[PDB]
mmCIF file of C-alpha atoms in Angstrom:
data_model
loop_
_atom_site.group_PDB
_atom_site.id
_atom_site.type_symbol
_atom_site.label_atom_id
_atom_site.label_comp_id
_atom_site.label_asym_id
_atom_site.label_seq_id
_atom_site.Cartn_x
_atom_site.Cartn_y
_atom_site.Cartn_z
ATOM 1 C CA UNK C 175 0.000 0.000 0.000
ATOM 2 C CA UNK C 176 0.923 3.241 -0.874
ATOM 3 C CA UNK C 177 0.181 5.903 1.454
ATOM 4 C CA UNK C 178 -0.734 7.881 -1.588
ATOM 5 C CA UNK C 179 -3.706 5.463 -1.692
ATOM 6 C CA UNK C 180 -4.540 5.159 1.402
ATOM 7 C CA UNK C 181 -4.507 9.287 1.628
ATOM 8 C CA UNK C 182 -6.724 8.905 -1.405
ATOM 9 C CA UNK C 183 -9.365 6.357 0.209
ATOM 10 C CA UNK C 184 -9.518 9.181 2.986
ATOM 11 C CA UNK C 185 -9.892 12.107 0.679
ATOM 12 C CA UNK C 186 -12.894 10.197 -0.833
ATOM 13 C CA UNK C 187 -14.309 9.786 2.757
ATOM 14 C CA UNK C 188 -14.005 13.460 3.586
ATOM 15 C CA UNK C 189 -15.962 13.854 0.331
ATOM 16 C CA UNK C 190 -18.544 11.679 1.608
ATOM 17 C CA UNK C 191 -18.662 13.457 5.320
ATOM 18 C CA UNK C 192 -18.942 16.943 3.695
ATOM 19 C CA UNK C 193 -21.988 16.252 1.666
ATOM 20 C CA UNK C 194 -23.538 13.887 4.428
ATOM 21 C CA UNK C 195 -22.859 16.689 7.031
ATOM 22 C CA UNK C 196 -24.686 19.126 4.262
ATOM 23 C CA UNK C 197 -28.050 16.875 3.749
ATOM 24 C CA UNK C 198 -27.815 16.816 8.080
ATOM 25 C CA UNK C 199 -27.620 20.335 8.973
ATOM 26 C CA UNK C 200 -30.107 20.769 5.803
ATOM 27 C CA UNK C 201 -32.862 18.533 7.456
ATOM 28 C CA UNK C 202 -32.598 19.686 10.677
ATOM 29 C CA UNK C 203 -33.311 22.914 9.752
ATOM 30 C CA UNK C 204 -36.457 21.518 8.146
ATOM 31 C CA UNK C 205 -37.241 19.708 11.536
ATOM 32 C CA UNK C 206 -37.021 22.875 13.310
ATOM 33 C CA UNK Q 67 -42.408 15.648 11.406
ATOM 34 C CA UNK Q 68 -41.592 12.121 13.064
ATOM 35 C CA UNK Q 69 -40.134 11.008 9.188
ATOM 36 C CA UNK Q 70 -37.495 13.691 8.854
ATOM 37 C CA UNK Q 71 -36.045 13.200 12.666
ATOM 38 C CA UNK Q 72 -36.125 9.876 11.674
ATOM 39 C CA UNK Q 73 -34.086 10.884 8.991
ATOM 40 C CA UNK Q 74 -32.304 13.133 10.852
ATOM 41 C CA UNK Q 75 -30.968 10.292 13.517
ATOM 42 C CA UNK Q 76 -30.617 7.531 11.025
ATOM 43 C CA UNK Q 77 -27.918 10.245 8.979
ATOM 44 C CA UNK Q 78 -26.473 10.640 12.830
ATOM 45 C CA UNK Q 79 -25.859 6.851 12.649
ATOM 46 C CA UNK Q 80 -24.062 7.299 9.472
ATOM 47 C CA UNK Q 81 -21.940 10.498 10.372
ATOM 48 C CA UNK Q 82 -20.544 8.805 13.089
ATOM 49 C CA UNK Q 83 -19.383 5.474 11.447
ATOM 50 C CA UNK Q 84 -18.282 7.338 8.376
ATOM 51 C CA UNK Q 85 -16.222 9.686 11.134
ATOM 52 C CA UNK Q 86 -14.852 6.506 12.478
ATOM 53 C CA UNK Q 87 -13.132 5.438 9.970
ATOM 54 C CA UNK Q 88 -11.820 8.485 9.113
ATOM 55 C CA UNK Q 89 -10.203 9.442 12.554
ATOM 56 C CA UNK Q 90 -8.721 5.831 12.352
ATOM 57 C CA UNK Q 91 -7.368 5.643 8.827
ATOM 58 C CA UNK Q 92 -5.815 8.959 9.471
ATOM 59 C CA UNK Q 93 -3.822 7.440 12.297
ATOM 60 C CA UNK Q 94 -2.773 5.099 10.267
ATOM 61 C CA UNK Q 95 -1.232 7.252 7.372
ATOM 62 C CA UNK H 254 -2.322 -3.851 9.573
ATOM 63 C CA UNK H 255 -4.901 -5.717 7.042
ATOM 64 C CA UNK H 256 -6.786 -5.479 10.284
ATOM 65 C CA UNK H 257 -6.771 -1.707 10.614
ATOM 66 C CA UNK H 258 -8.047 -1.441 6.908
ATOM 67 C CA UNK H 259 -10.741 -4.354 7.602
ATOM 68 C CA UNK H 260 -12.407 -2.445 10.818
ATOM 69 C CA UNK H 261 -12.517 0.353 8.484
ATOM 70 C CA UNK H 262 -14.214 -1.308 5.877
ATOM 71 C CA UNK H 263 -17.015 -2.740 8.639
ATOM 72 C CA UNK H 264 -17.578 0.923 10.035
ATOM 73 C CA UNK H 265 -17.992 2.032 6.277
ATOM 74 C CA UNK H 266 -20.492 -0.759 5.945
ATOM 75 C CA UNK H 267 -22.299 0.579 9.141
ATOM 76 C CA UNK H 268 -22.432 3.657 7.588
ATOM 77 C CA UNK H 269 -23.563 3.187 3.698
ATOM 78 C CA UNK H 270 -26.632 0.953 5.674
ATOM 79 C CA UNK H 271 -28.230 3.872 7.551
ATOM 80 C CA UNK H 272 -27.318 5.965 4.845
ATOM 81 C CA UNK H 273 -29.200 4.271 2.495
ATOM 82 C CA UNK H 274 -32.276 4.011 4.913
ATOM 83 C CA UNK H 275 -32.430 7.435 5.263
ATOM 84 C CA UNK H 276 -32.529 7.970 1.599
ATOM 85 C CA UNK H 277 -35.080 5.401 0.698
ATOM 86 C CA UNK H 278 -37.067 6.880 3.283
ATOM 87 C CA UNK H 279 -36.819 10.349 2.005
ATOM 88 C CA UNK H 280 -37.635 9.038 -1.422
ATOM 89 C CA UNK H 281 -41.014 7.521 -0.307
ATOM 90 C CA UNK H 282 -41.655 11.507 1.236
ATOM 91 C CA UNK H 283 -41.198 13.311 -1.590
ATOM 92 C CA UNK H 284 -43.734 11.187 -2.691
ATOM 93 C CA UNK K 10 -41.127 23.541 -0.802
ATOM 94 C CA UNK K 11 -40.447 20.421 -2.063
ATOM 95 C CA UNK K 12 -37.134 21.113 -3.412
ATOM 96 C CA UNK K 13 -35.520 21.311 -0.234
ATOM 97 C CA UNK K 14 -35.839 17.435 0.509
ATOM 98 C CA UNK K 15 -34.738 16.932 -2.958
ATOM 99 C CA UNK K 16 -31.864 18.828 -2.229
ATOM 100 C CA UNK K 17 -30.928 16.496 1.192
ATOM 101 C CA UNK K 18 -31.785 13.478 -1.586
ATOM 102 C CA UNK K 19 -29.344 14.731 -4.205
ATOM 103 C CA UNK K 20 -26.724 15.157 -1.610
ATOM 104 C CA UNK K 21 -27.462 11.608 0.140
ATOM 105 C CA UNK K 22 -26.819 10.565 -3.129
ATOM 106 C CA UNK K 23 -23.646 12.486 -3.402
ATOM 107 C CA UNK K 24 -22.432 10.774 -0.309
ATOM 108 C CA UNK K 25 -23.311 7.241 -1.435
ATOM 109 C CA UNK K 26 -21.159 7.521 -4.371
ATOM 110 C CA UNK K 27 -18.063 8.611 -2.184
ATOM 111 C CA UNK K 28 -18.929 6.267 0.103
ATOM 112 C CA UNK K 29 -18.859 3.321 -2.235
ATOM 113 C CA UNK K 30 -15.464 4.256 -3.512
ATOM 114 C CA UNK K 31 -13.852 4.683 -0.099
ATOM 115 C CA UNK K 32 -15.244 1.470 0.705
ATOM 116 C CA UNK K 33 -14.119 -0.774 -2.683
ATOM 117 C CA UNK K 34 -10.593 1.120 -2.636
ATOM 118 C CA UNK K 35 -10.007 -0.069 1.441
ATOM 119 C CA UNK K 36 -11.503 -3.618 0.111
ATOM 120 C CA UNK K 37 -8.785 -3.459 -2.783
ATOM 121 C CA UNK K 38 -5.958 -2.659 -0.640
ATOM 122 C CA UNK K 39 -7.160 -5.402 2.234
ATOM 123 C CA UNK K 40 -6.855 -7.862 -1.151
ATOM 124 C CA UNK K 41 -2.854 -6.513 -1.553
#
């Protein structure tokens, strides 16, 4: 393993987190 | 009402798994 | 270690299931 | 307004897709 690919695999989570954290704050401002 | 906060804590579930793994794998690079 | 990468993988697994819950769900409200 | 849960949808979605590559590039390197 490279850590070039394992800094990748992260990079694609942080990708993930940022547009789950978006559709979060999103619907919990229609909640309140 | 009850369907987005179930919505709502179900995404919770999945924020902190996701977060998880990422806290971990960046202890391991 | 492969095990490091593995517990990963099972949190990631974790998370894409209540993900997708939470989408399907959302789906059936907008209908 | 409607489009604001289609919104939370389309970035759910957005998410998924990150997710899923995270997940089969940690599988691929667990494979090495």
């Amino acid at each position: 393993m490279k850590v070039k690919q394992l800094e990748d695999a992260v990079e694609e989570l942080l990708s993930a987190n940022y547009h789950l954290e978006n559709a979060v704050a999103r619907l919990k401002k229609l909640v309140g």
